[PDB]
Nucleic acid binder design. Structure first.
Ligand code: SF4
Ligand SMILES: [Mg+2]
Ligand SMILES: [Mg+2]
Ligand SMILES: [Mg+2]
Ligand SMILES: [Mg+2]
Ligand SMILES: [Mg+2]
Ligand SMILES: [Mg+2]
Ligand SMILES: [Mg+2]
Ligand SMILES: [Mg+2]
Ligand SMILES: [Mg+2]
Ligand SMILES: [Mg+2]
Ligand SMILES: [Mg+2]
Ligand SMILES: [Mg+2]
Ligand SMILES: [Mg+2]
Ligand SMILES: [Mg+2]
Ligand SMILES: [Mg+2]
Ligand SMILES: [Mg+2]
Ligand SMILES: [Mg+2]
Ligand SMILES: [Mg+2]
Ligand SMILES: [Mg+2]
Ligand SMILES: [Mg+2]
Ligand SMILES: [Mg+2]
Ligand SMILES: [Mg+2]
Ligand SMILES: [Mg+2]
Ligand SMILES: [Mg+2]
Ligand SMILES: [Mg+2]
Ligand SMILES: [Mg+2]
Ligand SMILES: [Mg+2]
Ligand SMILES: [Mg+2]
Ligand SMILES: [Mg+2]
Ligand SMILES: [Mg+2]
Ligand SMILES: [Mg+2]
Lengths: 208, 125, 84, 151, 84
RNA sequence: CAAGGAGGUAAAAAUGAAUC
RNA sequence: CCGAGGGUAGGGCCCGUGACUGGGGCGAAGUCGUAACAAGGUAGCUGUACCGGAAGGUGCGGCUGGAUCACCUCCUU
RNA sequence: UGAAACUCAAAGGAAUUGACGGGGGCCCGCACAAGCGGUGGAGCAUGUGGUUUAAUUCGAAGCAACGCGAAGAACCUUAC
RNA sequence: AGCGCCGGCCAACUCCGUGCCAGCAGCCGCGGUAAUACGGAGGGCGCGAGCGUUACCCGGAUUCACUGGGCGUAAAGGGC
């Protein structure tokens, strides 16, 4: 399946923290506030100037490791975004943000995308009345993302909704903390999200 | 050239030539060894490269290379001709894949064992 | 096949035994391969010309050359030390 | 203020009685990603001396780049000796599709998206000079109508 | 003169070389003595008879024998290891 | 004052050593 | 009558194979000589012809992909 | 008219810096020539190659190694 | 949870073994004592229910040039 293992090593190889754990990332033990140098035995060595292919590869791997996805689905979403009307970068970022586990993470039902993927896969997420245990469901505008009725109590989810109570959600989303539901208003614009990735390097990387 | 020249004579295609005739359009060919020995390499190199003349199912009798460290190949061993040439060996344009009918894999190898056909060792884990 | 050791060749080899063992290991293998295939094999053998005409040179090290000659029954070792 | 990027660092040679005598060459491109780019080629017996002299020459020889929101206005084909480069405008959102030298040149000039191709000889010095001459020959609708007005 | 080693004799010389260091040094002491004086020296020079006539023996140890034949231009070492 | 247009030229002295 | 095929004789094209034989290529340096590259020690190359262990030599003609860079002979101070 | 098998990892064009010429022009150095005194011949000293020898410890190898490391080997030195 | 790679193209580096051997290899090429290029280890990179290899087709190849090449000396003006 997806990448299972050391995560701070991925956060450390890219040299930019990208929030893959949640509470640990906001904590002072973020592993980059202690050791902000790439992994391996040769991490503290001389920084050799990377080539043009290295920059685009690091860039692509950073964006792919942000959402925790495999190269199969990532390139498939890129191929669907390139052969579609509009700017190929913003539609790629919008198709990536329309993934169900990503919107569940944005709504605050989980503190991490892997946690949100586990919550979707376990049927704790309900989309428009019926539950959806697919972490790759492309959420369309107007869908009501909620929590199932058997999964209402859940000691974990109550602390997550209580911690999300106060934080505002993005402009393309709505949130009813007391109602345990949310709505996908529209597709996120390029200015709405401020990911630490230059999408142009990603598009010119795949165009071999 | 002029257009009338192009209408009269046209353009010739490229009609490329296969470098692996013995395979006869097959990815692999079974073959029986007949001579197994060691040969000396070409111009800027010295070694003892282990080759084997193979009489294979297409009626052809061609040399092949034996990669890895050591082998169990004799005058009547049935092997499989992979293809691909060895630069420093003349007349050797083929390879013998290991882990096959009688070409056992290389023992004790642990890094690149998909090549050379070595099973996964289990230090019981 | 009968190994013929010259006055100089025997001394050169003798000096290495009390000096460097690896060189001996290399010469022994070259001699082992030479009796099997006198003109092709290890040390990239090539026929020598006008100064040592009728002789063959097998590299021990990038500077040490094992100079030898072949007969139907014997192998004469001219030298195993220095450059020819 | 000006981004200085090196692309070609080569080692030449000069014969003299005794052996080989080296001298290094450096090809750097300077830009600001706002429509101003320069190219330089320096020769010195040491690498940083070569890059410093090349950057000093690159700041001297510059040219305007009439960008049109994300790219060049029209297409152009420029042959510099045996090297030929073809530039083409692209829609917003494709990326810099170029080789080693033109991506480094048009990237510092401010081009977001472009469609190029290296033809003929692929010498990085001549491809660079061809790219600079091709960017120099770029004209906009205001310029073309300024030449075709009559006065 | 020169050194002539039989295929069995060379194997015995090498077998000792990779097995016992004391023995090879002793072997070298004998051969050197031969060259200066062939019928004189260490090893109790004693000649063989009937079918081994023309071959002289010296004893490296109580068990092993260095069998040799001497000529004006060469020395012929037959064995330097008494096979079981 | 300068040079062109033309014209007859050494020899008997050969080879290269094997870490590209 | 035609007719599948069978048989007889004579051809045409292609493939494998053959004592022996001709050159080609590889095996970093076997023998013989010095042809070409510096006027390469007789400028070189070439078509042809003859000859010679061999590169090649010579005859006839041709070419610049060579030579007027100094005395000393034919015509000018 | 006009291929193929096989083989090679290149074959090439122009131009640059060098090196070389039994190419040229200009010009130096006991380089030649002019003129002395020598070595190679003899005896001996010293060093080296070779061979001998238990060991003859090692290095230096055209010019630019060879009375050179020794501006000082009877045992010391000294490494055989 | 497995597979390929970690000289350059090509993202990814140290130690030990080895010593023009054993071996790598698509090209340039690496190995005749410290081998980031062989074998192993640690570590890293790329993918992941797969990862590599082989064969074939297209691409790169504007090296059959309609788009889109050339013929003084590089292959190429036919002797007229
Ligand atoms: S704590 Fe979060 S941000 Fe920090 S290294 Fe780990 S995953 Fe990255
Ligand atoms: Mg669900
Ligand atoms: Mg080699
Ligand atoms: Mg042109
Ligand atoms: Mg002569
Ligand atoms: Mg000769
Ligand atoms: Mg009939
Ligand atoms: Mg000549
Ligand atoms: Mg000549
Ligand atoms: Mg003549
Ligand atoms: Mg003629
Ligand atoms: Mg004649
Ligand atoms: Mg003539
Ligand atoms: Mg003519
Ligand atoms: Mg004089
Ligand atoms: Mg005298
Ligand atoms: Mg010494
Ligand atoms: Mg790979
Ligand atoms: Mg790299
Ligand atoms: Mg490998
Ligand atoms: Mg070692
Ligand atoms: Mg090592
Ligand atoms: Mg490799
Ligand atoms: Mg390795
Ligand atoms: Mg799958
Ligand atoms: Mg094409
Ligand atoms: Mg055309
Ligand atoms: Mg062409
Ligand atoms: Mg020509
Ligand atoms: Mg031509
Ligand atoms: Mg004509
Ligand atoms: Mg004609």
């Amino acid at each position: 399946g997806r990448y299972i293992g050391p995560v701070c090593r991925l956060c450390r190889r890219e040299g930019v923290k990208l929030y893959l754990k949640g509470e640990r990332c906001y904590s002072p033990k973020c592993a980059m506030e202690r050791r902000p140098y790439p992994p391996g035995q040769h991490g503290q060595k001389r920084a050799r100037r990377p080539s043009d292919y290295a920059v685009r590869l690091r860039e692509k791997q950073k964006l792919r490791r942000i959402y925790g996805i495999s190269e199969r689905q990532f390139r498939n979403l890129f191929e669907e975004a390139s052969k579609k009307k509009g700017v190929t970068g913003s539609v790629f970022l919008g198709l990536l943000e329309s993934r169900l586990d990503n919107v569940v993470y944005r709504l605050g039902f989980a503190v991490s995308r892997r946690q949100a993927r586990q919550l979707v896969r376990h049927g704790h997420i309900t989309v428009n009345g019926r539950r959806v245990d697919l972490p790759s469901y492309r959420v369309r505008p107007g869908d009501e993302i909620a929590v199932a009725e058997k999964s209402r109590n859940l000691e974990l989810i109550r602390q997550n909704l209580e911690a999300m109570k106060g934080r505002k959600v993005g402009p393309w989303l709505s949130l009813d903390v007391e109602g345990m539901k949310g709505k996908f208003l529209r597709l996120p614009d390029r200015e709405d999200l401020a990911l630490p990735v230059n999408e142009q390097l990603v598009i010119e990387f795949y165009s071999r | 050239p002029t257009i009338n020249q192009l209408v009269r004579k046209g353009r010739e295609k490229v009609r490329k030539k296969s470098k692996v005739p013995a395979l006869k359009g097959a990815p692999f060919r079974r073959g029986v060894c007949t001579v197994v020995r060691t040969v000396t390499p070409k111009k800027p190199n010295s070694a003892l490269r282990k080759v084997a003349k193979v009489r294979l199912t297409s009626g052809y009798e061609v040399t092949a290379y034996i990669p890895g460290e050591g082998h169990n190949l004799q005058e009547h061993s049935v092997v499989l001709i992979r293809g691909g040439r060895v630069k420093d060996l003349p007349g050797v344009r083929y390879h013998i894949v290991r882990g096959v009918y009688d070409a056992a894999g290389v023992k004790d190898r642990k890094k690149s064992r998909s090549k050379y056909g070595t099973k996964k060792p289990k230090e019981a884990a | 096949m009968k190994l013929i050791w010259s006055e100089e060749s025997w001394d050169d080899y003798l000096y290495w035994q009390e000096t460097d063992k690896r060189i001996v290991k290399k010469i022994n293998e070259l001699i082992k391969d030479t009796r099997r295939t006198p003109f092709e094999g290890k040390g990239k053998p090539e026929p020598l010309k006008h100064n040592l005409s009728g002789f063959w040179s097998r590299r021990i090290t990038e500077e040490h050359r094992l100079v030898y000659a072949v007969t139907d029954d014997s192998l004469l070792i001219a030298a195993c030390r220095y450059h020819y | 203020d000006f981004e200085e990027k090196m692309i070609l660092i080569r080692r030449t040679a000069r014969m003299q009685a005794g052996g080989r005598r080296f001298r290094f060459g450096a090809l750097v491109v300077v830009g600001d990603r706002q429509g101003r780019v320069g190219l330089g080629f320096g020769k010195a017996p040491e690498v940083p001396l070569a890059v410093q002299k090349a950057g000093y020459y690159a700041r001297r020889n510059m040219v305007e780049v009439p960008l049109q929101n994300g790219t060049i206005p029209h297409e152009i084909e420029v042959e510099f000796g045996a090297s030929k480069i073809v530039l083409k405008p692209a829609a917003p959102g494709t990326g810099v599709i170029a080789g080693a030298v033109p991506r480094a040149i048009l990237e510092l000039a401010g081009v977001t998206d472009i469609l190029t191709k290296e033809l003929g000889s692929r010498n990085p010095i001549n491809i660079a000079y061809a790219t600079m001459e091709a960017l120099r020959q770029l004209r906009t609708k205001a310029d073309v109508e300024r030449l075709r007005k009559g006065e």
